[PDB]
Amino acid sequence: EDIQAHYDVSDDFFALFQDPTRTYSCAYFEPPELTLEEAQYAKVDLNLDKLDLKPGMTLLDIGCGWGTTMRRAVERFDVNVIGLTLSKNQHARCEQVLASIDTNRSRQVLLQGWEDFAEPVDRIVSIEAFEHFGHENYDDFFKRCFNIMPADGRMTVQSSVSYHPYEMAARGKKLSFETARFIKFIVTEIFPGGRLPSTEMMVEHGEKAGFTVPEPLSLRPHYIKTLRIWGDTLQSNKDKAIEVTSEEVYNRYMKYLRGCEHYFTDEMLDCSLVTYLKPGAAA
Numbered sequence: 001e002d003i004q005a006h007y008d009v010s011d012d013f014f015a016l017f018q019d020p021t022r023t024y025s026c027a028y029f030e031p032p033e034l035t036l037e038e039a040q041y042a043k044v045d046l047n048l049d050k051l052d053l054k055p056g057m058t059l060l061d062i063g064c065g066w067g068t069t070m071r072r073a074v075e076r077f078d079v080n081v082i083g084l085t086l087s088k089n090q091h092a093r094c095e096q097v098l099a100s101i102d103t104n105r106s107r108q109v110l111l112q113g114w115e116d117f118a119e120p121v122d123r124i125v126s127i128e129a130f131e132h133f134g135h136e137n138y139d140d141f142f143k144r145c146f147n148i149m150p151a152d153g154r155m156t157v158q159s160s161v162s163y164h165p166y167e168m169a170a171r172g173k174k175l176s177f178e179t180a181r182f183i184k185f186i187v188t189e190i191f192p193g194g195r196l197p198s199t200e201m202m203v204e205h206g207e208k209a210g211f212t213v214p215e216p217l218s219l220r221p222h223y224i225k226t227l228r229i230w231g232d233t234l235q236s237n238k239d240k241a242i243e244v245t246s247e248e249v250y251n252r253y254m255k256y257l258r259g260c261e262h263y264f265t266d267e268m269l270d271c272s273l274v275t276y277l278k279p280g281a282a283a
């Protein structure tokens with residue numbers, strides 16, 4: 001409780017390694033020559049383009065961050081938006097981002113989890129929403145998402161994933177134990193109290209709730225590029241980053257960024273964009 005609170009880091013630190021949109025998730029470098037900022041917009045479009053969004057629909061963003069996804073949805077698809085965040089700072093920024101949009105569409109941001117959310121919505125997006133998707137309870141999550149959507153409902157969940165210990169063992173015990181200890185570090189110091197799901201968990205929990213689940217998209221090569229730029233950017237701002245936090249916090253995040261790039265390159269971690277289609281989803 002108070003132990004986890006030790007790993008609280010101010011928004012200002014994240015600004016010193018992230019692109020100007022402050023997107024804390026895997027970018028999408030298509031085409032490959034996109035800047036990180038351009039690739040973060042490409043990742044939002046990759047997710048939204050899977051959701052069959054029509055004007056006047058309501059999109060739910062579970063873990064709406066700084067509001068980039070919701071704004072893009074309103075602008076591109078002329079939809080109403082509801083965002084869920086557990087960050088007071090993100091809630092405030094999202095309200096101002098949405099209010100700034102020239103639209104008559106409904107825009108709402110709620111300081112709550114999905115557990116408490118029970119309003120009808122047409123489509124759902126959730127992009128590396130650690131505070132929502134990082135504490136298991138997957139049967140309740142997929143049941144909620146299924147039940148709040150209409151017959152043609154669709155959802156995307158983008159999540160960092162690990163492999164089951166059995167699958168990790170296949171690459172040899174040395175690398176399996178090493179990866180398992182690095183994952184423990186991630187869910188202790190970077191995403192405290194977290195549980196990193198597997199792609200198989202993401203798929204099978206969706207299917208149990210009644211969703212059709214096509215082949216998940218691996219973003220592995222995109223996360224390698226994202227983490228390389230994040231790491232290189234943090235290192236370039238070392239003095240600034242240490243001033244705002246400490247040498248401890250700087251070393252912690254360089255370990256996270258360099259470490260994740262390594263285990264992604266070694267195919268011991270992955271990032272899955274999973275699509276969940278209700279039985280009546282358009283073909």
Ligand SMILES: Cc1ccccc1S(N)(=O)=O
Nearest residue numbers: 128129130134159160194
């Ligand atoms: C879902 C989860 C769980 C543990 C750590 C990190 C994540 S993430 N960044 O939301 O995909």
